[PDB]
Amino acid sequence: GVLYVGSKTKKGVVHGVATVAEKTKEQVTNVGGAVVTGVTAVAQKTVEGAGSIAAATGFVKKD
């Protein structure tokens, strides 16, 4: 395959993932993949395989 990404900017301001917690208990931010962040941002992922598992859970409690 082919990918072309041209970009042209004067002023760019980019936040990506921001968290704020005040006086809280048990705050979770969970990302299963990559975090990719830019004035120009490109991400490619390929997974080959008969039993691929991707699992993303915030939290587990037992008992």
Residues at the annotated binding site? 15
Count of positions on this chain that bind its own copies (CB under 8 A): 63
Task: Give me the least distance between CB of 62 and its own copies, in Å please.
Answer: 5
**Which residue has 């900017």 as its token pair?**
9
User: Would you state the structure tokens that stand for residue 22, as one six-digit string?
Assistant: 């005040």
Site of interaction with Cl ion (CB under 5 A): 15-16, 18
To its own copies, the closest distance from the beta carbon of 52 in angstroms equals 5
* Window 3-42: residues binding its own copies (CB under 8 A): 3-42
Measured CA angle at 19 (ends 9, 34), to 5 deg = 65
| Contacts with its own copies, residue ranges (CB under 8 A) | 1-63
